[PDB]
Amino acid sequence: EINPIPVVSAFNNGPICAGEDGELSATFITGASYRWYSDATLTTLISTSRTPIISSMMSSETYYVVATVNGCTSLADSTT
Amino acid sequence: EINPIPVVSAFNNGPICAGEDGELSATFITGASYRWYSDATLTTLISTSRTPIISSMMSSETYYVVATVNGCTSLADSTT
DSSP states (O other), X not given: OOOOOOOOOEEEOSSOOXXXXXXXXXXXXXXXXXXXXXXXXXXXXXXXXXXOEEOSXXXXXXXXXXXXXXXXXXXXXXXX | OOOOOOOOOEEEOSSOOTTSOEXXXXXXXXXXEEEEESSTTSOSEEEOXXXXXXXXXXXXXXXXXXXXXXXEEOOOEEEO
């Protein structure tokens, strides 16, 4: 059985005002797990949710997402 | 049948102000049960929920989580 590699895209709420809670989201892939990272090298894990909430953002920041399907991992996408 | 060992990660709401209700969460594993402990030795059980609520926290505290799948237990993760 040769499994396909899933493709996932990342998104956000558009510009947000400092002090507000930012939200991240990603495309839904049936059966996929998701992992969000703060590092470009994917070494620090933030959360494991399709749509995590980031409390009290005071400054611009970037996030990376990897989706996993049937043991196969997507390339990470990113959003700012 | 040889079952895999599940991997579960723990999270929280980020810094919270004293007197507020803190929340814990953990990665979702399909079919897993969850157990949260207050002790590093996993001897005191707090709750059995993926996302328990901790009322009125007045000080920093740490929690441990174990997920169980098909009778196999994960290593405990932790969050502060």
